[PDB]
Design a protein around this ligand. Sequence first.
Ligand SMILES: [Zn+2]
Ligand SMILES: [Zn+2]
Ligand SMILES: [Zn+2]
Ligand SMILES: [Zn+2]
Lengths: 279, 299
Amino acid sequence: MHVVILGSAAGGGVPQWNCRCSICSLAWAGDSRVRPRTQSSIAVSPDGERWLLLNASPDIRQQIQANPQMHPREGLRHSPIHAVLLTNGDVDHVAGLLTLREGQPFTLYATPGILASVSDNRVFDVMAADVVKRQTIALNETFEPVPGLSVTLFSVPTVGTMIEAGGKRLAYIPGCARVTEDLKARIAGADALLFDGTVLEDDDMIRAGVGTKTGWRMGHIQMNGETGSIASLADIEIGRRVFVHINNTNPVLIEDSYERASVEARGWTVAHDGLTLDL
Amino acid sequence: MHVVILGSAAGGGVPQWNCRCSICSLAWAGDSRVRPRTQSSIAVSPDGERWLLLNASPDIRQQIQANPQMHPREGLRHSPIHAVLLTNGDVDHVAGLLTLREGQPFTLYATPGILASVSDNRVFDVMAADVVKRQTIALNETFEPVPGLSVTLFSVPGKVPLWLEDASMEIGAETETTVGTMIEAGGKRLAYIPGCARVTEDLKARIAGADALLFDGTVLEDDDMIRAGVGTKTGWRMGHIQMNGETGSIASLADIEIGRRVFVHINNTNPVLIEDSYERASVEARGWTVAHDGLTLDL
Ligand SMILES: [Zn+2]
Ligand SMILES: [Zn+2]
Ligand SMILES: [Zn+2]
Ligand SMILES: [Zn+2]
C-alpha cells in the first residue's frame, strides 16, 4: 500500500494566516526550524497509480502540485485521483472539493448526513452531477473505492478510517478525544497508525496565547502524560506511529526542539507534508 | 497606492490540477517558460499596512504566505487584511473566504445579489456573524473600506457563475452579478475588472484616465480552450472578451488613456503565459503587461 501525507497540520495549517505565535512566526520568517504545513489530508493507493483521497483540505491545490503522485497523467481529464472520502463535514475537510470542479470524474464517498450537508450548499454543485458520483456509505461498512483497496469507517471517542490492501493495514485517526481499550483493540496489529497530534500538552493553545480552550475541551487527547496518546498507545503493536493533524501551537513542529526529540524517542514520527509510506 | 497581485490566473490556476495542456505541462515539469500562478486575487493599500483584499481565491493561504504584505502582525488576531471585496460569485473568487474563519474581524463587501448568494451557503457561516461584518454595496456607490482608500463598484457585462447557471442562462448582461471596481487613493486611480464579457463605451469612460488598469485576460482568442484541446467552451461562452481581433479587448481599449495596462485572470490555456511566445511579445508590443504572482505596483 502506498501512502502520501498531503497535509500534516490541524485546521489553519502552519502557519495559520492570522497567527503570530512563536512557531508560526518562525514560519513567517522562513526560519528552517519550522516547516510550513497544509491542512490534514492523505492519499492512499493499492497500486501507486489510482488513488483515494481522504478529505479535501482548503490547501488541496497546493497539495496536488507539491506531490508528483497527484500530478495529472497525459491526455484529457486524466487524474490519478479516482475517489474522495470525507470522514467528517468540517470546512477543513470539504473546502477542497471546490477545487476539484473542472469536469473531472471521480466518486465522492461520505455518510448520508455529510453528503446531504454538502448538497445543501449550491456552491458545491461545481462538482457536476453528471460528472461526480456522490455515493453514501455507512459506518462499519467495508467498501472498495479503488480496486484492491478496502476502506472501513468506525466511530472513535467522530470517525476513524481503516484502510487495507495486499494484507497491509493503515489506521487513519486525525481526531480523537480519548484512547479506549476498544480503540486499542481495533488499532493493534496495524502496519501504520496516523493519529491525532493536535496538542503536545493539554494547554498548548493557552500557553501559546491563542486560545483559552484545553485540548480536552476541543476533543483532542494530548501527546504527553500518563493519560496522553503516547502512553495510552505504547503497549499495543503498531508498525509505524505517525502524528498528523498537528496544530500550529505544537512545539514538536520545531525541528531541533527537545519536545520533538522526546516524541521521537518514544517511537513516534512527527509527520510533514509529502511524507510517504510504502507498507 | 500600493498594489500586489496575489493571483494572476483564471479559475484553475496554472497549472490546473487535472490539465496537461502544453502550458500546464511546462509548469508541471518546472520549465522556466511558464511561471506557476495562483487564482485571481489582488490586495490594495493606501498606506502599505492596512489592506483591502479583492476576491478570495482557493489559493488564498498560499498567497498570504508568499506575500509578506499579507503576513499577520505581532500579537493576537492581528492581520493586515482589514476588508474583503468580491467582484463576482465565481468559486475562484469566493472559496478563499472559508480560510478566513479563525475569529478574525474584517468587513466583507459585495453587491446585494452576490452577498446573498454567498450567505445562502451555510458553509460560509465559518465567517462568524459576531466577527465578520457583511456589508452590501450598491452599483455606483463609493465607499471607504480602508481609511484613505475609496472604492466604487460598477456593473460590467458578465456571465452568471457556473454553479448558478440555468436553462435561461445570462451571458453578457449587466447586473449586480458582475462588477468592475474603481479604486482611488492619494489622487491615483486603479481600475480592477478581472471578469468582463464585452467592452462598452460606458466602461471605456469609467476606465479612461486611470493610472492603472487590471483587466480580464482569460483568453487570447475566442477558441483558446479548443485549440489547447482541453475543452469545447468558447471565451464568449465563459463570459470573457478575448484579447485579440478588431473586436477584442486590446483593440477596444487602445483609444483611451491608461497609465499602465495589465492583464490578470489569465487561463492556463492562454499562450501569453509562455514567457518566450510570439503571443506574449505581441500583447506587450500593444502596451499590455502580463501579470505574474507577486507583481507589485506603487502608484
Ligand atoms: Zn480539523
Ligand atoms: Zn501559530
Ligand atoms: Zn474566474
Ligand atoms: Zn492547461
